[PDB]
């Protein structure tokens, strides 16, 4: 059922956005740095208040300054994340009764003796990107 | 020198004092009851208060104090001022704090005569306290009304069953 | 839990299109399998999620998402900003609560002056 | 000869207390402590009668009988051998300690197990210094539960002085 | 370039050391912060009163008493 696949896709995209957003949260520099450079390549780009940039804050809380190696690292990580996202968005674009309900619900009875705890779909993903 | 304040005698059995210490004993002379010092003139008193030993005694008194000290329910609708007197006080001093309710046992009263029942006291900074007698041992005492969310505010009672229409100044309690 | 998951997600798939096939299934079969249909069963809540999600997939069917890198970044920044804001609201709340605790703890509950003797959730809103 | 009194109204005066308790028995003195800071009493008192019998009888009669300003008044009445032991086995329960040391001496209290350094040690309370001398004589540097244990006197430098033997001998006698 | 160029031997060496350390260092130290956001005695008394003067009593465990 394509519905399930497209669902899982939108969900994963959500997960990634949330990850790189958490990152941009802990150390605003990640975005700021980037954005500043972008400013001088695409002149239109709107950039945050200077005060925010300096105090390394996004709203009220000023975050601890990080060293260069880490900023760059996380930027490349976010890079691959955005790659994944672009891929999923792509496949998704390329992908997007009662008797059948009971029909499938019947086959769901298959292998009743499957003693196993299953807590690994959103946790393995959430975890896969944190 | 005294700034025109009347310093009462020690024996006069207590108009709020400026410094609630310096007295005049049965004799004429001036005293500081903390430091147990006798002062001849008010200038010497002002030097005592500006002295170091009196500060030490004030702190030691500070520490000395700080170490010791399907059913039926009721609903109340309390109304408050209509911007009549609250126009002179708006300095965000607990102004954001809503009225508060507490259940008090009559076992303790200013007169201590009769007792044996509870009161649903309701209080707000300027206005005077209010009470409501509750003979019934228990009414409307519910069981997990909401789904256990933890913002204690003041207590389970207040969050559980109170509403503060601050825009109209109406406090509902049930 | 694969069974439960699968039945929740399936009944959620069908429930997302008609909502009539399940209400008929319940009366036709009579199985303690779909006991999550009632808001009583905890899992029901997660159900309400899945369906919504599927309901969402039905939203832009026939429409592609053309978000660019720049945009995705901007978005994640704005989300961050939001989170920060929410965090601030939480903080403020905690503060006010603190004030309340202080004052409640600091008023005379012995200054009595009584007079007589003896649903709010939908009321604590606005309309 | 003195009895404790509690749950007293700070408004109560020594006059009222005396008038109350003289009904029960002759009262030699009443020490009713006041805070000299606030000139406010603390809500308790000590009432000293002449003999013990009057005190006991007053305790029996006046407890929870009378309410003063609704407040129900309360009336109430009012050095041994020690051994440090080191390198104990973790399999030794305090009760097993009891069974070990009972044959050597009668325990006034129970042993105390505490860990130093990991290192299981204990304090053992005997009613006698000589029984403890037996416990040390037999048990010192001895293997129990496949572990060598050391038995000596606990520090206060430790117990077992001459004055200690004398005054412990007297407390026993 | 100009800096390194105007260095001495020891200086240039220590600087190189620094660049090296920066190069081969963990991107996250075991000693970093998480959630540290900012916003926007009577000495003379005992000698007078007699205390803190060692004294001994034989009858109770040969006990010591710090004041008379
Ligand atoms: Zn003074
Ligand atoms: Zn002594």
From Swiss-Prot, chain A:
Family statement drawn from the similarity comment of this UniProt entry: Belongs to the SF3A3 family.
Biological function: mRNA splicing factors, PRP9, PRP11, and PRP21, are necessary for binding of the U2 snRNP to the pre-mRNA in an early step of spliceosome assembly.
Name recorded for this polypeptide: Pre-mRNA-splicing factor PRP9
Subcellular location: Nucleus
UniProt source species: Saccharomyces cerevisiae (strain ATCC 204508 / S288c)
Assembly information from the UniProt record: Belongs to the CWC complex (or CEF1-associated complex), a spliceosome sub-complex reminiscent of a late-stage spliceosome composed of the U2, U5 and U6 snRNAs and at least BUD13, BUD31, BRR2, CDC40, CEF1, CLF1, CUS1, CWC2, CWC15, CWC21, CWC22, CWC23, CWC24, CWC25, CWC27, ECM2, HSH155, IST3, ISY1, LEA1, MSL1, NTC20, PRP8, PRP9, PRP11, PRP19, PRP21, PRP22, PRP45, PRP46, SLU7, SMB1, SMD1, SMD2, SMD3, SMX2, SMX3, SNT309, SNU114, SPP2, SYF1, SYF2, RSE1 and YJU2.
Miscellaneous comment text of the record: Present with 3920 molecules/cell in log phase SD medium.
From Swiss-Prot, chain B:
Top-level taxon of the source organism: Eukaryota
Disulfide bond positions: none
Zinc fingers classed as Matrin-type: ranges: 30-60
Localization: Nucleus
MF term (GO), any: zinc ion binding
Biological process according to GO: mRNA splicing, via spliceosome; spliceosomal complex assembly; U2-type prespliceosome assembly
A GO term from the CC aspect: nucleus
Family designation: Belongs to the SF3A2 family.
Function: mRNA splicing factors, PRP9, PRP11, and PRP21, are necessary for addition of the U2 snRNP to the pre-mRNA in an early step of spliceosome assembly.
Quaternary context: Belongs to the CWC complex (or CEF1-associated complex), a spliceosome sub-complex reminiscent of a late-stage spliceosome composed of the U2, U5 and U6 snRNAs and at least BUD13, BUD31, BRR2, CDC40, CEF1, CLF1, CUS1, CWC2, CWC15, CWC21, CWC22, CWC23, CWC24, CWC25, CWC27, ECM2, HSH155, IST3, ISY1, LEA1, MSL1, NTC20, PRP8, PRP9, PRP11, PRP19, PRP21, PRP22, PRP45, PRP46, SLU7, SMB1, SMD1, SMD2, SMD3, SMX2, SMX3, SNT309, SNU114, SPP2, SYF1, SYF2, RSE1 and YJU2. Interacts with CUS2.
Protein name: Pre-mRNA-splicing factor PRP11
Residue numbers of the full-length protein present here: 34 to 253 of 266
UniProtKB/Swiss-Prot annotation, chain C:
Effect upon mutating residue 80 to A: In SPP91-1; corrects the PRP9-1 growth defect through partial restoration of splicing and by a complete reversion of the pre-mRNA escape phenotype
Superkingdom of origin organism: Eukaryota
Localization: Nucleus
SURP motif repeat placement: 7-47
Annotated signal peptide: none
Its biological purpose: mRNA splicing factors, PRP9, PRP11, and PRP21, are necessary for binding of the U2 snRNP to the pre-mRNA in an early step of spliceosome assembly.
Subunit note: Belongs to the CWC complex (or CEF1-associated complex), a spliceosome sub-complex reminiscent of a late-stage spliceosome composed of the U2, U5 and U6 snRNAs and at least BUD13, BUD31, BRR2, CDC40, CEF1, CLF1, CUS1, CWC2, CWC15, CWC21, CWC22, CWC23, CWC24, CWC25, CWC27, ECM2, HSH155, IST3, ISY1, LEA1, MSL1, NTC20, PRP8, PRP9, PRP11, PRP19, PRP21, PRP22, PRP45, PRP46, SLU7, SMB1, SMD1, SMD2, SMD3, SMX2, SMX3, SNT309, SNU114, SPP2, SYF1, SYF2, RSE1 and YJU2.
Note: Present with 2490 molecules/cell in log phase SD medium.
The protein, known as: Pre-mRNA-splicing factor PRP21
Species for this entry: Saccharomyces cerevisiae (strain ATCC 204508 / S288c)
Record gene name: PRP21
Full protein stretch here: 89 to 228 of 280
Swiss-Prot record, chain D:
Keyword Repeat: yes
Gene3D superfamilies recorded: 3.30.70.330
Subcellular localization: Nucleus
BP-aspect Gene Ontology terms: mRNA splicing, via spliceosome; U2-type prespliceosome assembly
SMART domains for this protein: RRM
Cited SUPFAM superfamilies: RNA-binding domain, RBD
Superkingdom classification of source: Eukaryota
GO cellular component entries: nucleus; spliceosomal complex; U2 snRNP; U2-type prespliceosome; U2-type spliceosomal complex
Main localisation: nucleus
Domain (RRM): residue spans on this chain: 1-78, 81-156
Record-level Gene Ontology MF annotations: RNA binding
Alphabetized UniProt keyword annotations: mRNA processing, Nucleus, Repeat, RNA-binding
Function (record text): Possible SF3b-like factor.
Subunit record text: Interacts with RDS3.
PANTHER family linked: SPLICING FACTOR 3B SUBUNIT 4 (PTHR48030:SF3)
Other remarks in the entry: Present with 1240 molecules/cell in log phase SD medium.
Name of the molecule in the record: Protein HSH49
Organism of derivation: Saccharomyces cerevisiae (strain ATCC 204508 / S288c)
